[PDB]
Paper text:
To obtain more experimental insight into the dynamics of BtuG lid opening, we determined the structure of the BtuB1G1 (i.e. the BtuBG complex of locus 1) complex by cryo-EM. BtuG1 is ~70 kDa in size due to the presence of a C-terminal extension of ~250 residues that is homologous to the BtuH2 protein that was recently shown to bind B12 on the cell surface of B. theta; thus, BtuG1 contains two B12 binding sites. The additional BtuH domain increases the size of the extra-membrane part of the complex substantially, facilitating structure determination by cryo-EM. We obtained ~3.2 Å maps for the complex in the absence of CNCbl. The additional BtuH domain (BtuG1 H-domain) is clearly visible and appears to be docked to BtuG1, in a position that would not allow B12 binding. The resolution of the BtuG1 H-domain was substantially worse than the rest of the complex, implying some degree of conformational flexibility. Interestingly, and contrasting with substrate-free structures of SusCD glycan transporters, the BtuB1G1 EM structure is very similar to the BtuB2G2 crystal structure with a closed BtuG lid, and there are no particle populations with open BtuG1 lids. We also collected data for BtuB1G1 in the presence of 2 molar equivalents CNCbl, but analysis of the dataset suggested a destabilising effect on the DDM-solubilised complex caused by the presence of CNCbl, analogous to BtuB2G2.
Contrasting with Enterobacteria, members of the dominant genus Bacteroides often encode several BtuB vitamin B12 outer membrane transporters together with a conserved array of surface-exposed B12-binding lipoproteins. Here we show that the BtuB transporters from Bacteroides thetaiotaomicron form stable, pedal bin-like complexes with surface-exposed BtuG lipoprotein lids, which bind B12 with high affinities. Closing of the BtuG lid following B12 capture causes destabilisation of the bound B12 by a conserved BtuB extracellular loop, causing translocation of the vitamin to BtuB and subsequent transport. We propose that TonB-dependent, lipoprotein-assisted small molecule uptake is a general feature of Bacteroides spp. that is important for the success of this genus in colonising the human gut.
Author numbering:
A (entry chain A): 49 to 95, 96D, 97 to 257, 259 to 375, 380 to 415, 420 to 681
B (entry chain B): 27 to 379, 388 to 660
The structure:
């Protein structure tokens, strides 16, 4: 299967594993990818950006059904925007992402998170599939869904997804007025987390002649409240954030007989962001910043096979990213990537190379940097599925439009960072006997070097945070994972999984002690747990399915200074769920009962943004 | 395996001698970061020598809030204006416990975001980014009246019975621009009486002497470096003088102001000394000892010791410093890692948690006749306007009781001090110590712990007649320079009162030398000549030492003689102590005395330096070891 043969470090959750990982809005399931440090905010509908291996959170690229989405305004992408109702396959690639048949924007990013949309099967007869997954509970959370699927002409299929997601989200978090132990404590309710998400999707799959002409039309309107940080003695926020993201996406694939595969990608993305703060003390009575984004994306990637085992890829891209506000930037980008000697050989080298070059015409930088990537999957010992893997990858951040064109707080001369990665790993899998149908363990020691890091440093006056290239973070962590399914007796799967990360991410920007950043030399960076880990346990019985999932994160620090005054404590998030399917005259009903944060721990991952406590979520679903 | 641990601060807490004249407690307010609510209020107790970084959280078992902006001590209470948390902590002074929580909130639940506090006739007036000034009683601690002063306000001050509030309008930079107004509020009716067009974005505002208000005005863009300092006459409430020198903030004593500028493009920081009367800069660098400064966050002035407290914030991410400088710019000490972005340092003398007692720190000055100098006719010379010589003597005793520094002026000016009890003679080791305000430079031209040495000859005498009067025979102490060619015995100098009151003071000696002690722009009193002296010409008699100050430019170093002189060395770390066994008579013979009572100190060096004036022996407080 997958996750073993991949040269780059791949982790995959299928539909049954994401079923076992009880979560919504994707980012609660991203936390189990064994290297991911998530930067999160409050609960449902918060900003939930992702860092791949404690790199920058803008070094990730999340791809919605074959094309990466690109947030330009504060390029840390909102992962909680995507919901888990229609996700067939979730996958994290730390590198080249195995095969070289991708659009060019998938390359030159230090890690990609691939969300795959449910591809309909259409079993015999049955033109029409109807699915609803009404989820409710957890302080006013409501979520109806519709999944109208329809076959048209035996090669055309249409999927219309709808998701209303009104919410209240008042969490009974526990606020501590300090950091030490002898502190008076309060039971305060979270305010202004009213999320009113709405997602619409019309996807057309055209299995022509192999040929695919997959299309998607996505709409997303939201009216989420943006809660403030829990400042002491004062919690009254009225910040509203309206998003109106939409895109029309096209994905043509053609197999031009032997030694030729061709692909076209197209995308028109329009985004709207209205940030209202009526409690702000601007003399016109509150900020009403509106941001308009547009992305024209094109790709004409081709793959040519020299032999049956060796291949090359030439992937040309194109992007016009325009922005308007309330100056008014426009970025023209051109990526082309030549994938090198990719060999898929049996018990010898599975080596692969990739050189991608980029060209941006923006009043800003005009970079033409070349980015190499080498991934080898050498495999001795033919009798067992044991892989040695090694990939070197040099990626780089682009400075976001908030980093360049925010109202004279962001710099214009930002150097566009670096991400230099040398992961080496051992991947083992076996299916010995029938007591253990599947066993797998994968350990990757990796060394990430970030140079010229774009960081927001405060200035303690008006236009508070300012962009500066002051950071040279060196990451030297090791990430292990395991998946062990054992079946005692019969039909009683005790499917287990686990993950662990010894993350050593030291800021080494300036070695001398006589410097403001010399106190940060050889010190852990701000939001990065050292001993982050996770685990899951699925109990598959025919009368009731059970699932458990726990998150451990070690002593997260703050600001990189590493004193006990700005320590964040280690947390454990334990969760349980139950699943049941009913067959009612060929209609599949599904009952789901999820308890999230089972041990009622009021924990925070970013300071003064407390995560929800024990929540109960009830899902009733109708299939066909 | 969690090997991640809190790595220590490595550097020590204090990197200098922590001495201060008459200051009991010193409170440092630290902002922390925005939306991170790790603000703090640290203290240093000079009496107990105790440093407490988390004093508010150690007392009330709860954090201070988010971005605590201002602190002020008034009427045995400490008022802390906390911005993002929108609170005013009004904590009690002797206990340190919070007594009442004032909610700086509007009609709805929206925060007013208050910034600064000013006091006038037991009412606390607090300005906000809401554009409001609130009056709070010091007894009931309730918001009595709210006035609207227009756009966003940053700092508030009291002068001539009127509140001056700097309407910054800072948050409107992306819209209608920053405001350009300072509002004037009366006490009696408490309405906005006048609005002064001052210049764009007025920030820190402070009253001064000669009945005036000094306010710093920024640019329309803060990074543009269009800073100015505006002197506003409080009689007419109009802009009087606009100084074009770049200021972020400033601290005022007398006619002079210590002000720092800090650009944001090149990150260049400078701290200058400025004359508020002449309108010109005096020293383009305030730190004249080579101490590196990177990010001064704010500058304060000790109201009753004269020192200058500049806080360090660095990258606004690591814990800052608090650096104490003297008037001359030499570093006294620095508190390291005292808090996250230390904003405001305030001072007190009443402490928290007896003249009849001996207390080993002397009792009362008997004779005080100083030579003319730069410190004469000021508060450090025990003189105020219109008081006679006996009033100067009893103020000298009062300043000696409160451990305040007393100056001696130029050459020959002498002071005579006694104790509660006679100091017994300790054979083989030292007997008494004289505390001095001299500080050491870390690097000089030569060794021997150089810095600002102002040597003075000490004399001792025994109260044999027991009348408590300085009529006994005086014995000079043989110092390290005694008996050599480096000293000039039988030196008689005389000073003439200048015919202008504000003139340079002329001195002539019996060695054929004629000269002046010069006026400098730091000390701008009526005369450098002592005003309680009724005679035109005064004379002094004593030994002249060799001049120890060497011109290295603007970085004059007083090189220290080894031993045997007052204010010759810093007051700790040896060679500042004295024993009875060094005393010799007029003929130079050694005299052994079983006890001692009377200590006389006069300045040994007749030398002009320049911007630090003449060599002046400053006596802190004499103290015995028994
Ligand atoms: O009158 C002055 C006093 O009045 C008010 C309060 O009791 C004290 O803080 C003090 O300031």
């Amino acid at each position: 299967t997958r996750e073993v043969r991949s040269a780059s470090p791949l982790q995959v959750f299928n539909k049954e594993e994401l079923k076992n990982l009880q979560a919504l809005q994707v980012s609660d399931a991203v936390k189990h990818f064994a290297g991911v440090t998530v930067k999160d905010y409050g609960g449902i509908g918060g900003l939930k950006t992702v860092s791949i291996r404690s790199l920058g959170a803008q070094h990730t690229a999340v791809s919605y059904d074959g094309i990466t989405v690109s947030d330009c305004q504060t390029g840390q992408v909102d992962i909680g925007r995507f919901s888990l109702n229609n996700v067939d396959r979730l996958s994290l690639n730390n590198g080249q992402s195995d095969n070289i048949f991708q659009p060019a924007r998938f390359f030159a990013s230090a890690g990609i998170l691939n969300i795959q949309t449910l591809t309909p099967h259409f079993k015999e007869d049955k033109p029409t599939n109807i699915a609803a997954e009404f989820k409710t509970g957890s302080w006013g959370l409501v979520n109806p869904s519709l999944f109208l699927e329809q076959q048209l002409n035996k090669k055309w299929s249409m999927t219309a997804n709808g998701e209303w997601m009104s919410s209240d989200g008042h969490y009974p978090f526990t606020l501590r007025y300090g950091n030490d132990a002898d502190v008076q404590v309060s039971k305060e309710k979270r305010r202004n987390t009213d999320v009113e998400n709405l997602r619409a999707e019309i996807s057309a799959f055209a299995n022509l002649s192999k040929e695919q002409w997959r299309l998607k039309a996505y709409y997303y309107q939201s009216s989420r409240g943006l809660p403030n940080a829990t400042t002491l003695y004062y919690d009254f926020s009225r910040q509203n954030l309206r998003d109106k993201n939409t895109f029309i996406q096209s994905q043509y694939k053609k197999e031009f007989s032997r030694k030729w595969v061709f692909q076209t990608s197209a995308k028109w993305n329009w985004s709207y962001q209205n940030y209202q703060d009526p409690d702000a003390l601007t003399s016109v009575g509150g900020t009403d910043n509106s941001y308009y984004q547009q992305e024209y994306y094109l790709s004409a990637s081709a793959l040519y096979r020299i032999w049956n085992n060796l291949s090359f890829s030439l992937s040309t891209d194109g992007s016009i990213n325009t922005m308007n506000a309330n100056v008014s930037p426009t970025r023209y980008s051109w990526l082309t990537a030549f994938a090198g000697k990719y060999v898929n050989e049996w018990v010898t080298l599975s080596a692969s190379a990739l050189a991608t070059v980029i060209n941006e015409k923006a009043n800003a930088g005009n970079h033409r940097k070349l980015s190499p990537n080498v991934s080898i999957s050498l495999k001795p010992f033919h009798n067992e599925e044991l892989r040695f893997r090694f990939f070197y990858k040099d990626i780089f951040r682009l400075p976001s439009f908030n980093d360049l064109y925010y109202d004279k707080a962001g710099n214009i001369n930002l150097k566009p960072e670096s991400a230099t990665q040398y992961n080496i790993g051992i991947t083992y899998s076996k299916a010995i006997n029938n007591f253990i149908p599947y066993l797998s363990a994968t350990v990757d020691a990796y060394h990430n070097k970030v140079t010229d890091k774009i960081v927001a440093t405060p200035t303690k006056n008006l236009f508070i945070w300012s962009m500066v290239n002051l950071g040279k973070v060196d990451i030297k962590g090791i990430d292990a994972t395991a998946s062990l399914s054992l079946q005692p007796l019969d039909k009683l799967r005790i499917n287990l999984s686990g993950n662990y990360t010894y993350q050593r991410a030291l800021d080494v920007t300036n070695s001398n002690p006589n410097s403001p950043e010399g106190k940060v030399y050889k010190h852990q960076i701000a939001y990065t747990p050292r001993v982050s880990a996770s685990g899951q346990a699925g109990i598959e019985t025919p009368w009731l399915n059970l699932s458990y999932s726990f998150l451990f994160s070690g002593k997260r620090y703050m600001l990189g200074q590493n004193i006990s005054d700005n320590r964040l404590d280690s947390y454990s998030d334990h969760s349980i769920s139950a699943y049941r399917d009913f067959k009612i005259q060929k209609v599949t009903a599904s009952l789901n009962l999820e308890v999230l944060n089972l041990m009622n721990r009021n924990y925070e991952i970013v300071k003064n943004f407390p995560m929800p406590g024990r929540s109960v979520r009830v899902t009733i679903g109708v299939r066909y | 395996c969690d090997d991640l641990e809190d790595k220590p601060s490595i550097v020590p807490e204090s990197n200098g001698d922590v001495f201060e004249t008459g200051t009991a407690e010193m409170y440092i307010l630290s902002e922390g970061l925005f939306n991170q609510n790790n603000s703090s209020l640290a203290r240093y107790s000079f009496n107990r020598q105790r440093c407490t970084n988390n004093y508010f959280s150690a007392n009330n078992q709860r954090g201070l809030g988010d971005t605590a902006n201002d602190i002020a001590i008034y009427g045995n209470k400490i008022y802390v204006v906390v911005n993002v948390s929108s609170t005013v902590e009004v904590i009690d002074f002797p206990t340190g416990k919070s007594i009442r929580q004032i909610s700086m909130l509007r009609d709805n639940g929206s925060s007013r975001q208050p910034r600064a506090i000013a006091f006038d006739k037991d009412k606390a007036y607090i300005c906000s980014y809401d554009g409001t000034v609130a009056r709070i009683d010091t007894t009931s601690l309730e918001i009595e009246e709210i006035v609207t002063v227009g756009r966003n306000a940053e700092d508030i001050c009291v002068q001539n019975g009127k509140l001056y509030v700097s309407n910054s309008g800072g948050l409107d930079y992306s819209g209608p621009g920053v405001d350009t107004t300072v509002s004037v509020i009366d006490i009696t009716t408490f309405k906005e009486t006048k609005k002064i067009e001052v210049g764009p974005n007025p920030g820190k505002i402070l009253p001064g002497l000669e009945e005036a208000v000094y306010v710093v005005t920024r640019g329309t863009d803060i990074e543009a470096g269009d800073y100015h300092l505006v002197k506003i006459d409080s009689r007419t409430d109009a802009v009087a003088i606009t100084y074009d020198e770049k200021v972020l903030s400033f601290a005022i004593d007398g006619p002079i102001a210590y002000l720092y500028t800090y650009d944001y493009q090149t990150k260049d920081s400078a701290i200058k000394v400025f004359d508020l009367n002449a309108g010109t800069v005096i020293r383009d660098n305030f730190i004249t000892d080579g101490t590196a400064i990177q990010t001064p966050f704010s500058i304060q002035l000790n109201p009753f010791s004269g020192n200058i407290y500049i806080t360090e914030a660095y990258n606004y991410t690591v814990k800052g410093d608090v650096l104490c400088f003297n008037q001359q710019g030499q570093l006294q000490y620095r508190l390291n890692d005292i808090g996250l972005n230390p904003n405001t340092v305030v001072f007190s003398d009443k402490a928290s948690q007896d003249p009849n007692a001996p207390s080993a720190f002397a009792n009362k000055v008997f004779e005080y006749i100083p030579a003319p100098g730069q410190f004469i006719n000021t508060t450090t010379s025990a003189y105020e306007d219109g008081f006679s010589a006996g009033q100067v003597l009893e103020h000298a005793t009062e300043k000696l009781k409160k451990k305040s520094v007393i100056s001696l002026g130029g050459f020959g000016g002498t002071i005579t001090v006694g104790f509660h009890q006679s100091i017994r003679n300790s054979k083989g080791e030292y007997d008494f110590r004289i505390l001095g305000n001299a500080s050491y430079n870390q690097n000089t031209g030569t060794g021997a712990l150089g810095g600002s040495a102002e040597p003075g000859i000490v004399l001792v005498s025994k109260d044999e007649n027991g009348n408590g009067l300085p009529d006994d025979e005086w014995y000079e102490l043989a110092g390290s320079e005694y008996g050599k060619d480096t000293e000039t015995r039988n030196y008689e100098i005389t000073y003439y009162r200048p015919q202008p009151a504000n003139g340079d003071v002329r001195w002539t000696d019996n060695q054929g030398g004629e000269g002046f002690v010069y006026r400098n722009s730091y000390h701008q009193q009526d005369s450098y000549y002592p005003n309680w002296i009724e005679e035109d010409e005064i004379t002094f008699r004593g030994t002249r030492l060799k001049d120890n100050a060497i011109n290295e430019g603007g970085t004059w170093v007083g090189y220290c003689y080894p031993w045997g002189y007052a204010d010759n060395h810093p007051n700790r770390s040896e060679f500042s102590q004295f024993k009875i066994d060094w005393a010799v008579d007029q003929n130079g013979n050694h005299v052994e005395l079983d006890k001692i009572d009377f200590v006389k100190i006069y300045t040994a060096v007749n030398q002009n330096v320049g911007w630090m004036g003449e060599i002046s022996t400053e006596v802190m407080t004499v103290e015995d070891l028994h």
